[PDB]
Amino acid sequence: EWQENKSWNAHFTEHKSQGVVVLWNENKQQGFTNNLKRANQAFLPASTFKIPNSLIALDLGVVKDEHQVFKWDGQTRDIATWNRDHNLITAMKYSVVPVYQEFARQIGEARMSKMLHAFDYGNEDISGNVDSFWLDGGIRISATEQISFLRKLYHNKLHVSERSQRIVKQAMLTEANGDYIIRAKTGYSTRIEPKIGWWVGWVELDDNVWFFAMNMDMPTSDGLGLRQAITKEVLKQEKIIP
């Protein structure tokens, strides 16, 4: 079942922005959101696509393991952390597009398309350039569709090896303390309107897991921090985290 909680709209209209948060209680199998319509509106996945992209690269052998080094191609880009060597862990952490563009080129159109259908990922449409379709191509995914994909990953139910899924979930590690663990991936879509930010993942507790998927309008990069801050405010309000 689902439940709409418009009280959460304050967290967006307090920072003069608009967006949706979708929560899923795995134990109770119940969903919650501030906006049922936007929860089912499909956007470019942008860097959240590095989750499925990593899974495919690992399962096809394009990426041997999370230690394999992908050397900087020597082209200076405006993101300083991109102008250096990376492995899967750091490429995820710093959302290093050029590393994942190379993954996609080595994956190829046919295998990429085959895998996204097996994953039931979004509209499963890779139309556009194989090395940028998740930034300015035809692929689209909604917040509720992100949840369904993430739940499969959590339970090792995606049609790739258990090893591939374990490695990606390691690479998704974002925060951990004595109270909770967050595995998640940010996204920032700018090439097609509306410009949005993503944060998708889940919160591990001692005895339950809460999946989440949020997106919000992002007219400029100044508000990127609100992706995590708004999500955590919702989690705090629902007393999912202290």
Ligand SMILES: COc1cccc(-c2cccc(C(=O)O)c2)c1
């Ligand atoms: C043109 O590329 C841009 C433009 C503006 C920002 C980024 C960027 C890079 C790394 C992390 C993140 C992030 O979501 O925190 C954002 C990339």
